[PDB]
Structure formats: structure tokens, C-alpha cells
Design a protein around this ligand. Structure first.
Ligand SMILES: Nc1ncnc2c1ncn2[C@@H]1O[C@H](COP(=O)(O)OP(=O)(O)OP(=O)(O)O)[C@@H](O)[C@H]1O
Ligand SMILES: Nc1ncnc2c1ncn2[C@@H]1O[C@H](COP(=O)(O)OP(=O)(O)OP(=O)(O)O)[C@@H](O)[C@H]1O
Ligand SMILES: Nc1ncnc2c1ncn2[C@@H]1O[C@H](COP(=O)(O)OP(=O)(O)OP(=O)(O)O)[C@@H](O)[C@H]1O
Ligand SMILES: [K+]
Ligand SMILES: [K+]
Ligand SMILES: [K+]
Ligand SMILES: [Mg+2]
Ligand SMILES: [Mg+2]
Ligand SMILES: [Mg+2]
Lengths: 527, 527, 527
């Protein structure tokens, strides 16, 4: 309907590259141990100071729509890297810039950019195979502290506290971050649980800073049957809201009308309510349901055995937590007010079920239920004197936790951009199908030198000399941009998770090689 | 009522041609195996990268209204080709440009453009007769894989998975495309329903991306009679209001008051409901509704035998699907929660009904019911690392599926624009009625060289030499624009569906020859 | 109340002439067999391509209000000709231009434009008398096919299908046009009826393309008395709400409150309802009511005999149609779901009423009822590959049907503007009263050569030489602008209805001679 502006050829590509270059030049100053921060003006209050790459990327939009298309594409790169890795967004941004630039620099009349994209993706597949080859598994908590220290801009306190947090709880344990009122950071180990079901509707969010629903001292409603009917929720809503306590709803499947009633009470009069789907695809659903009802003090409704209905609800059947956090993909309960004796009875029942099971698949479910009910969670309270320092350190702690989880789950490689420098001979052993595929392979081969060059460039030295010196050294020797020396990267602790590196490379390559294939760009006429 | 700007003669034609040329120049870069992509700015979020011609055509509007008229007419060409064939929109666009240009150039004082249009339509009828003459029936699954590979920009994975899909579900089976969370594509065979009735009111759409109504884990309400009264729908709406699963309504005819109440609940409070007309005409309608109620677990209301009324409705009388998709022209049911024993009993009843029928018209209806209840549905999940790559690959997969359906419907011809090049000697034998019909025949004869020239142009070579060498070669020799050589197009698999080619040519010719009959263009004064 | 701009003398006349000349120059390009089309931009999407003169006229408005007055006056000419003839609007437009121009030219100080207007109307009366003298009745269906072929821009397919439609249904039978989904046109004979009562309130219009009410599978409510009371329509609207079929209300006189209730349900919630007055006056009214009730299956309410009231209405007392079309001046029922045996019994009752009567005035009413029950309805479905093609052919099909009806009603004359050329000696036999009547007679005498000149001018030749060659030839020799030769017009089939020609001439002359009497033009100052 709206009038459109259409551009052709290399002018649209030049404008798109200009937007890509603006956003990636703003992001690339944050890279490494000599990286600097970015101040982002906030419309409501105090401005935000950050070193996190996706926060810099999301904050940038341009009036020029042709530049804004490239800005949005690199934003998609940074957002995908933050979503499936939680770290390495600056690396993905500079890799995407390099692929987009070297792809725009190689488009001619006889060139086929789709075959160039095929070559690019084939070369990235080769490099990810070599990354999986070079990777080694994390076996010592010293490496855990090293990963969390490197990912938190060389903060040894953050790495030590994260290593202690998963020493006390679990390498696959639940570790959370929140604001602290003290100057220094602290770690508290408290009882809690966490399951992988998020909210059902996005209208429940009352905290637009982390897109999550946050209540304190709220009721919790467990049910084996789907909490559906009007006479299933309206007595429940009356009992919950009328008691001066908010309501958390756990049920199997919630789709249709009563959530729209919940939204009508949330948006008009402001009812503090949230609904979460129940985890479990069988008897484990009922088992975890009963475990959370025991830990919270509430009961289970719609069950097969007792047949407790949601019409006749009483206040002494609703569980009480001290805190609940409901995100898009996961929800969690904190400090349930259930009886300690009943919790101990359920823990001993789980032990006696673990003593009579040998199928090696229900045993890990019972062990997960025991780890949920028994050891609790970890909470990092981040110190500082103002909210801007707390927010910047919180971003660093989130990066360090994400990287540490990725290094537990997939392993580690060499840091400082050296693990991409070591994958060049794998591209030197490829045989291209045709010339455009060779162009794509050479594009990826030149792109693999970019993160180390950016790290060294932020350190005030010439990155190409550094990178040449790294390629002429042995396989364990890279650059330490904090110290300014060429060292053994493993024994000095400069290591990266393999998952973060491969996620950044793949998410950069796909979007940037799709951007290279363009010939015509269509934007709207600005009004 | 509004003030108008009126232009006469060749100035209005020149401006209209200018709009046609802008839209078709944006579309023509996408053609062939060396075609490039088009980035379209999206107002909400990330921009859209596409190679599909009708998306580029529909994304372009102009401020100049005289140019916008030609843009809308070529957009109508592309839309009609996408509706009637699902493929070949870029070819229809370049053919429409060629006919519009050659018709605008041929208009003089003594010329009759309506007789020129008559000549155009006569020549296109001749060329479509020759296309139906040259067509060969697809009798190998290798040809299936070749068609789906060519239509998906030379992607052998998409062609292989589509060929395997209709190896599993049948050539006239149903294959669907949806988003995938993995990197690579995969094929899943579910048991599901699909019939050729769409939604009745257009207010039922929730997802505005494909103009379809999509629910998951939804109730299903079937009635042999029309769901007709407020006291028929209000028990059903109170069940879907309380028991909280989306309501899918299968009824004979729905036009009046209760659907307006349904729209009122759709728009004000947001009731997730959809209504679909019943398929079939006669006892086949009742048989299909009984089959659907058996497969979903629900019952049939308003029947002649049992006389189960729509006033007394129970929760255990509604079917439960796992997913429902209702588009404008067809609807679909996924994972009906019916009894397996009841479904098997209905399948054996259908077998025993097939064993006592010999009229050869009810036998194909019974076989269609058997393939509905037994053969199932096919699901293609499209992989990728970002939504833009997934969306562009989904466009290519939809093109390949549409072209494979057209090739099992009407056979195949030569690819690369060669089947239009082979119809020139058919035009070299028509005798024109008069001079203007001769002009129209020559316009079509020059237009028949255009798709091959555009394909060769996008491949970096000069297309007139290519077309001249194809026309001097044998009937089985065309250009391989991917390989840059002259090959056997049947042996190398470069083949097009006949239906796509004739649909594109007819839809281009009609609108372009109607455009070239215009002396006066009336537009609105811009405010 | 608004401030006004007032102009005097020949400047205002020149500006009005300018508007008349703009609209008539846009319309005159469409005239004849070598006429061209006009593209009109539509705000809701695809533009309209047309050759119909009144469609071009109604689409043109000017910003300068002095030109807009003349444009709207020629719009009144074209609209009146389209209303009382259905054809000849381009001829009326060019005649009105000629009279307006030659009247503005002849205005001097001593001239009286009102006696000039009297001369104009006297001369037009003479020419219409000579047209009625030259007219010949249509006796052969070859002339029917010739009229419908000429009126549809010279294709024999529309003429052949229209001639076959009144061979199957009759020359006074009803023939309707709707869009077809096929490429080619086809003729369908359906059983239906048609009376001359339109809608009663204009709020019932749902389809704003032809200002008509369009329902399918609709209830029908017939009453012999006026459907007046609230408790007469609340059971009926309750049944329409409780059964989901649009209510078609047929009653005697409908003026008051319950139609305002119908409008309130039409606009707020959307009740599909329409009310039509009952045709006939007296016993014929109730006879047609009983015929339509026994044809649709419903009953008659408020009757004298059975006394069936509108308070107690049952679902088995409403008729069911398959299609109903309610326009401004007439309504029409298609596919009534009545008993075939009851319809046959009413047919034999009508035959046995015909066999005992000789009054020769209600016998034609009985024959009309028999035709409404037995003769049927022709439906012309228009083919094409796009909606612009379908609309452009549908305008010509409507023009050909209108012309064929006018040629059945009043006969035929020579085509190509020759029947106006043959009326010049009749004007050469008048004796004017004074000199201004002589001026008006000479104005009409010069105007009578304009349609043939415009036809020849659209054919690329000089129209004045053609017209001078026509007047020197015999009375049966005129120009054939398609073939460019002078032929026998009756033998070659180039014929026009007499009614169309006289309607166009009279409607042009009245408005143009009223326009040429103006000394002062008062417009509004634009804001
Ligand atoms: N002392 C060091 N010497 C050399 N390289 C280092 C050193 N410390 C960290 N690095 C490297 O710097 C990179 C970390 O940069 P940074 O954390 O700013 O960006 P990122 O991981 O791409 O993205 P994000 O902004 O999301 O954290 C990693 O490649 C890491 O190996
Ligand atoms: N390797 C090839 N060599 C030559 N011609 C080819 C080759 N592969 C495909 N073609 C031809 O290119 C055309 C396909 O182009 P493309 O799919 O981009 O456009 P389209 O079918 O006109 O429209 P749409 O954009 O809707 O898909 C067909 O005529 C096909 O035969
Ligand atoms: N082959 C022909 N040779 C000469 N005159 C012809 C021929 N065919 C049609 N005509 C004449 O052309 C006129 C028809 O023109 P046209 O139908 O375009 O306009 P119209 O009847 O004035 O109005 P409308 O736009 O409503 O159709 C008639 O006078 C008809 O007799
Ligand atoms: K950073
Ligand atoms: K294309
Ligand atoms: K005309
Ligand atoms: Mg980091
Ligand atoms: Mg294609
Ligand atoms: Mg006409």
C-alpha cells in the first residue's frame, strides 16, 4: 500500500554495508580484555553503560532505511548468538561484518552469489568440524574458574564465585543473578527448583527489563487435570486474589478462554497472576507435580486417586513460595512454605524408588527430582555503588555463567581468536566444486583471522602482525592481549567454549552470506 | 467526488510502461540458477530476503500513480500466476513486460489495439496447443526429484526430500511446510485429515503471515445438520468457554447470526474459534463427517438415525485434534485423539464397502476415505540458523512442491525457457485475419524468446546469441545456465511443468494485451 | 453561507466548455469498433479498464469548479442515457459536447439562448419523429445476434450466446450476468422468477459493486398483509437467528419502525436481511404471492382464507431459495426449494384458469405467472484470466443485453451514426419561427454528423470526407469502420436500436441546450 523506494546493484549494497559497518564498528570497540564500554541513552532514566555486544547491537537503528536493513541483519546475528549461546555476540558481529564486506567486494557480472553462499556454508561446516576436533572436555574446576574469568573481562572474583557456586550446587545446577545492596559480590545457596516451561501468554510480563514475570510471596496452584472451566478458575481466582496473595498456576495444557479472563483481570484491574504449563510427558509429570505440591505445601487437584476438584478449593490447598520467576522458556519457584517433614518423606521415598530401579532412564529422572528437592539453587547478588555499575557487572556475570555452562556441555578451545586461526589448514585442504564456491571458501578463510585482529586492535597494536606471528608459532601458542606477550594459551587460562565459537561463526555466516546474495533492495518512502 | 488527473496518448503509456519496467526489472534479477535475491524492508522487524517473483511484485508500490497502475497490473499478473500454478511468477512478469512494451511500441493512428489483442490471444492459444502437444507425462520418481530440484534453485536436498515424501504419502498425497528448529531439513509422516473447504468468515484469521487460522490442541464439533440456533451454539460455546480448548466447527452451511456472535467474541474478548463448511454432496458428506468424528473421537450431531441434538452437548462428544490449519480454500486436522480400535474398525468397514462396489465412482470416493484415514500427511520442516534463511528456503520449498504437483497434474516440458522457444514454428504457420492480428502474433513471437534471454542474462552471458544457438540446435538441446553449456535438457533434468508455463504465458498475455489497448488514463490528484 | 466566486459572460462559458471538452475527449476515444479503452485508477487495489462511456464519465472530476460544472452536466447526460437505455452513452456524450460547443459559439448580444433552446428541442423532436419513421421491427434472431454483436465491440461470441439465451428463454425473459471462473463464456438455464420491486431501504446493500443485495441459501417470508407489528417480526427474526438463513421479507407496504429494527440489526451486529414490496395490485398480488410461496416451499401469512398469523411462525413455513438478487428497482429469486409436484399442480391450475377465460388482459398476467413458473432464467457467466478482463467483458455483455432488449422493444435503425445522418432532410423541411429557433435547428443539424465523424476519426481516417460520402450515397449505404469500406449496413449487420439512438439524442439535447442558456456561473471559493 505504501509507496516504495527501489535500489539496484552496488549502491544498495554500499548503503547496506554502511549500516553494517556502523553497527559493527560500534560493537567492535567492546571486544577483548582491552575492550571499552558503550553508553546507551535510555528514554526513562539513567543511561546504560555496557560492554555486551548484543546490547550495543539492539540499541542501534538508523534513519536511512537501506543502512537500517544491514543494521537489522547484524542485529539478527547478534540476537541469534545471544539466544543459542548466551556469549560471543561481538565475535559474531565482527565475523558477519567481514563476510558481508568480502562478499560485497566479490560480486561481479559473471559471479553467482548463491554458489558463493554455498561455498561459504561448506567452508563453515569444515571449520566447525575442525572446531569439534580441536575441542577438549573440561575436567577440572580450575578450568571452570578460568572460563568464567575470561568471559567476565578478566575478573578473577567472578570466576572464583561461579566456580564455587557450581562446586556447592552442580555443574548442571541452577545459578541465578540479581541485584545486591552491598559493595561486594556474594553467593547464597538457598532451596529452590527450576523447570523448562515458560509462560503461556506474553501478557503476564510486569518486568520489561528481562521480559519476565516476577512475584513474591504468591500462591501456587497444582493440578493433574487441565485447569480449564469457569467454575474451575473463578472460585480459584476468588480464593487466591481475595487472600491478598498473588497466584501461580501450574496445569497440563492451557489454551482458549480462561487465560483471556486472566488477561482481562491483569490489564484492566491488575490481577497478579501467572500460568505455567506442567513439565513431564507421562508419570514423571505427576511425580514432579506431587513433588512441587509437597515442597510448596499445597495439594494436587484433578487427580485420579483422591479426585480433588477445582470447584471446592480451600485456602489450605494452595502452596506458598517466597519468590517465583517466570521467563519465556523456563519458570522457577523459590523458598516454598511446605512442611520440612513432608519434604523429607518425599526425599526418602525418592531414595527408596532409586533403590528398586535399574532401567538407567527412570534413575536419572529420580536423581533430577532428588536434586530439585534436596540441594536447592545458587543466587549471585552483584555488588556496586550505583545501578549502572551493577548492571554492567551483571551483564558480565551473565556472560560468564552462559560461557561456563557452554564449556561444561561441549568443552573448550583456545581463546583470543586462535581457535579460528587454527582451522585455516582445514580450509586449505578443501576442493571447491567451481569458482564461486572457491570464492566463498576464500571469504571464510579471510574471515577466520578477524576476531584475533579485532582483539589485538583494541589492544593498541597492529593485529595483522600479531596474527601472522600466531600462524607461525606452534599450535598451543597464541597472543595474550592483556599482557602483550605470546604465551601458551591453555596454561595461562585464555580459553573459550567451543559451542560459543561455533554458534557465533554459524550465525554470522548464514545471515551474512544471505545478505551477499542481494541485487535489489526495496524500502518504504520516509514520511 | 475527488479531483482527477487525466492524461492522453503516449505520455500516459510511457509512464505506465515506466512502472511496469521498474517492477519487472526488480523481479527479473531473480530468474534462473544464477538469479539473485531481493531484500524487502519489513515495517515490524527483520527485513525479508526472497527470490520468489510474486513477493517482489507485491512488495512494490509507487508514488507516481500512472506508474503505479502498471505496477499493479503486473502485480495482478504475478498474483494470478501464483494462484493458478504456485510457480512461474517471474516468467509471467517478464512475459507481461515484453507484451506490454511491444504493444506500446506498435500503437499508431491507423492501428486497432483491440484487434492486436485478438491476435495476441489467438497466438497464445496456438502456443498453448503446442505446449500441450510437446508435453510428456511424468512416469519416474527421478523426474519428480528433477522437477523439485529445478524449482528449488538447483537444491538436490529439497528435491530428494520431496520425492521421498511423495514416495511415502503418494504423488497426490498431501505434503506441508512448516518452521524447523534444526539446521537441516527433515521429513515427518503424521496421520491427519485434509479437505477442500476453507473458513466461512474472514474475521477468523489469527496468523496474518499466510492468511490462515492456526490452533493447537483444539476441540472439534461436527454436526450432520446445520449448527443453526443460538441454543445450539451457546451450549457448545459454554463448553469451549469453560473446558478451554479452541473450537473447530464443521457444519453444512453457516451464514447469519451465530457466526456474527462468533466474530463478536473473536474481536472483543478474543474467542479462539473457527468454522468450516462440510465437504461432499450427498451421503459422502455424512460418511466423511462420521469418519472425522471417529478419527477425532467426537460424535456427529443432528443425525437422522440417533438424533443427537446440539442443545445437550457434553465434553465427551467433541473431537480433539493436536493441530488445525484452516486456510481460505482448504482446512486440515492433525493428530485426532480418537480410539485406534474405532479407526481400525472404520477402515475395515471401508474395506468391506469397497469389496461390494463396482460403479467405479463410489470406489474412488471410498479409496479417498481410505487414503485419508490410513496414508496420512507429510510434514517438511525447513532448517536454518535464522528466520530469514528459513523463510527464503520455505519459499523455495513451496515453489518446488507446487511445481511437482503441477507436473503430476499435467506433465513436463523443457526447462530454461526452451519450451516457449520451440513453439515459434507453430506461430510461423498461423494466417492472420488482418494486419493488427499479424502485429499481435509478431508480438507473441518476439515475447517467446524472453524467459531464455532473461535466464542467460542473469548468467552473465549475452542472451540473444544463446537463443539463436538454441533455435539452430535440435529439439532436445537447450542452454544449461548453471553449467554454461548446451546440453540435453531431459537428460540433465532441466524440466518445467507444462501447467506452470501455460499459466504464466496466459496470465501475462491477457493483462498485458488489455493494458496495451489504453488511450486515456485517469488517476487521482495526490493530496 | 460559504463565500462564492461569481463569473460572467464568455469566460465562465469558456471554462465550462473546457470541462465538457475534457470529459468528452476522454469519452470519445472509446467510440466505435476501432475505439480504445480507458484505465481508471481505483483506490482499493487494481485499476479499472473500460470502454463504457458512462464509466469514463462518472470517474472524472476536476479541481477547477467551473470546469467541474460542465463535467458533471455531461455526467448527467451519460447517466440518464445509461439509465433509460443502458447503451449509447458515448454517443450521448459527444452529441452533448457538440450542442454545448455550437451553442456557446452562437451566443451574442442580440441572441436569445432560450429561443435557441426551443429551436433545439423542436429540431430534436423532428429528428425523433424521423427516427420512429425509419425504424424497422426485429423479426429474425439473426438480427438479435447482429445487435448483440455490434453492441459488444464486434465479437460474434457474445452475440451468439445472447441470441441462444433468448432462443432458450425468450426475448422478454430475464438474462443475468455474473463472473465466471473459466476462460470461456457459458450459458446456464436455471429455474427462477423476477418481479419489478426493488429494495425499500438502502441500508440493506452489502455488495457495493452494483448497489445490490446478494444472499445465498436464504429464507423467504411472504405475507398477503402488511408485515407491521413488532410481535410479527420478532418471531421471524428469532427464527432467522435460530436457523442461519438470510431473511427475505416480501410484504405489501413497508414504512415505519420494524425496518429500522432491521437496519439496527444490519449495522450494529450484521443481520443478513432484506425487505421487498409485493408486486401486483389486487388479486394478481396475492396470486403471485401464492405462486412464489408454492415455488419456494413457504406459506402465505395474513391471508383472508386460512388466516395464518405472523405471531406464530414455524420453520416449515419459510421458503428457501438458492440465490436472491435485490437491486434498486427489481428483485429476483433463484433456485426455490419447493416441491416439484406442488409447482406442477400450480402450473396445471394456471393452465385451467387460462382455459376458461377470454378477458385478454388478465390472460397476459396468467401467461406471465406461467413464465415465472416454467420459462426459467438465463445466466451468462463471463470468462477471462483476470478480474480486469472479466469486468471489461462484462460491461460489453451488459451493453449488448441492454441493446438487444431495446431492439426487441422498439426496433432497429442503421448503425455507425447513419440513422442520425439520414434525418438531416427532415430538419431541412422545418420552417423556424424566429432567427434563434433557426440557430437551434442549425445547431442540431450540425450535431447530427458528430457520431459518424467520431467513429471514423477513431478509425484513423478523416470523418468529414466519410460523412460527405455517406450523404451522397443511397439510403442503405454507410461506412463500415472496421473494414474501412462503404457497404449495405442492414446486410452486413451494422444496426443500432432506435430507442438507444433517440434516448442519447434527447438526453444530450436537453441538458446541453439548458447549459447554453447561462450568463452567470456561481461557484464556491476553494478552501
Ligand atoms: N587476556 C586475553 N588475551 C587474549 N584474548 C583474550 C583475553 N581475554 C579474553 N580474550 C578473548 O576475547 C574474546 C572475548 O571478547 P568479548 O567477551 O568482549 O566478546 P564476545 O565473547 O565476542 O561477546 P560478548 O560481548 O557477548 O561477551 C574471546 O575470544 C576471548 O578468548
Ligand atoms: N540449470 C538451469 N539451466 C537453465 N535453465 C534453468 C536451470 N535451472 C532452472 N532453469 C529455468 O529457470 C526458470 C526458473 O526460474 P525461477 O524459479 O527463478 O522463476 P519462475 O519459475 O519464473 O518464478 P518464481 O519466482 O515464482 O519461482 C525455469 O524456466 C527453469 O526451467
Ligand atoms: N463495424 C462498424 N462500422 C461502423 N460503425 C460501427 C461498427 N460497429 C459499431 N458501430 C457503431 O459504433 C457505435 C457504438 O459505439 P460504442 O458502443 O463504443 O458507444 P455507444 O454506443 O455510444 O456507448 P457505450 O459506451 O455506452 O457503449 C454505434 O453507433 C454503432 O452503430
Ligand atoms: K564485548
Ligand atoms: K525467481
Ligand atoms: K464506448
Ligand atoms: Mg564475552
Ligand atoms: Mg521457481
Ligand atoms: Mg455500446
Amino acid at each position: 500500500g505504501s509507496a516504495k523506494d527501489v535500489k539496484f546493484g552496488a549502491d544498495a549494497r554500499a548503503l547496506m554495508l554502511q549500516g553494517v559497518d556502523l553497527l559493527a564498528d560500534a560493537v567492535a570497540v567492546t571486544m577483548g580484555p582491552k575492550g571499552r564500554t558503550v553508553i546507551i541513552e535510555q528514554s526513562w532514566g539513567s543511561p546504560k553503560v555496557t560492554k555486551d555486544g548484543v546490547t550495543v547491537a539492539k540499541s542501534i537503528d538508523l534513519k536511512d532505511k537501506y543502512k537500517n536493513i544491514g543494521a537489522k541483519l547484524v542485529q539478527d546475528v547478534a540476537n541469534n548468538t545471544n539466544e543459542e549461546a548466551g556469549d560471543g555476540t561481538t565475535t559474531a558481529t565482527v565475523l558477519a561484518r567481514s563476510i558481508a564486506k568480502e562478499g560485497f567486494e566479490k560480486i561481479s557480472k559473471g559471479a553467482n552469489p548463491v554458489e558463493i553462499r554455498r561455498g561459504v556454508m561448506l567452508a563453515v561446516d569444515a571449520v566447525i568440524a575442525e572446531l569439534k576436533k580441536q575441542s577438549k572436555p573440561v575436567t577440572t574446576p580450575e578450568e571452570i574458574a578460568q572460563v568464567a574469568t575470561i568471559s567476565a573481562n578478566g575478573d578473577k572474583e567472578i570466576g572464583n564465585i561461579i566456580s564455587d557456586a557450581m562446586k556447592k550446587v552442580g555443574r548442571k545446577g541452577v545459578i541465578t543473578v540479581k541485584d545486591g545492596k552491598t559493595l561486594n559480590d556474594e553467593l547464597e545457596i538457598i532451596e529452590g527448583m527450576k523447570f523448562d516451561r515458560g509462560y503461556i501468554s506474553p501478557y503476564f510480563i510486569n518486568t520489561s527489563k528481562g521480559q519476565k514475570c516476577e512475584f513474591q510471596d504468591a500462591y501456587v496452584l497444582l493440578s493433574e487435570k487441565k485447569i480449564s472451566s469457569i467454575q474451575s478458575i473463578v472460585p480459584a481466582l476468588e480464593i487466591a486474589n481475595a487472600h491478598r496473595k498473588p497466584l501461580v498456576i501450574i496445569a497440563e495444557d492451557v489454551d482458549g478462554e480462561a487465560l483471556s479472563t486472566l488477561v482481562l483481570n491483569r490489564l484492566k484491574v491488575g490481577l497478579q497472576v501467572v500460568a505455567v504449563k506442567a513439565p513431564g510427558f507421562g508419570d514423571n509429570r505427576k511425580n514432579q507435580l506431587k513433588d512441587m505440591a509437597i515442597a510448596t505445601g499445597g495439594a494436587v487437584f484433578g487427580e485420579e486417586g483422591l479426585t480433588l476438584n477445582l470447584e471446592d478449593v480451600q485456602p489450605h490447598d494452595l502452596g506458598k513460595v517466597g519468590e517465583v520467576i517466570v521467563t519465556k522458556d523456563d519458570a522457577m519457584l523459590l523458598k516454598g512454605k511446605g512442611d520440612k517433614a513432608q519434604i523429607e518423606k518425599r526425599i526418602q521415598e525418592i531414595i527408596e524408588q532409586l533403590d528398586v530401579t535399574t532401567s538407567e532412564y527412570e534413575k536419572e529422572k529420580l536423581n533430577e527430582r532428588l536434586a530439585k528437592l534436596s540441594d536447592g539453587v545458587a543466587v549471585l547478588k552483584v555488588g556496586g555503588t550505583s545501578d549502572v555499575e551493577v548492571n554492567e557487572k551483571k551483564d558480565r556475570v551473565t556472560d560468564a555463567l552462559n560461557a561456563t555452562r557452554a564449556a561444561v556441555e561441549e568443552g573448550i578451545v583456545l581463546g583470543g581468536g586462535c581457535a579460528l586461526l587454527r582451522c585455516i589448514p582445514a580450509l586449505d585442504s578443501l576442493t571447491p566444486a567451481n569458482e564461486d564456491q572457491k570464492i566463498g571458501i576464500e571469504i571464510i578463510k579471510r574471515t577466520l583471522k578477524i576476531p584475533a585482529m579485532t582483539i589485538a586492535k583494541n589492544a593498541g597494536v597492529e593485529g595483522s602482525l600479531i596474527v601472522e606471528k600466531i600462524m607461525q608459532s606452534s599450535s598451543e601458542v597464541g597472543y595474550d592481549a592483556m599482557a602483550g606477550d605470546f604465551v601458551n594459551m591453555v596454561e595461562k587460562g585464555i580459553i573459550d567454549p567451543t559451542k560459543v565459537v561455533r554458534t557465533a561463526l554459524l550465525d554470522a555466516a548464514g545471515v551474512a552470506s544471505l545478505l551477499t546474495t542481494a541485487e535489489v533492495v526495496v524500502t518504504e518512502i520516509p514520511k
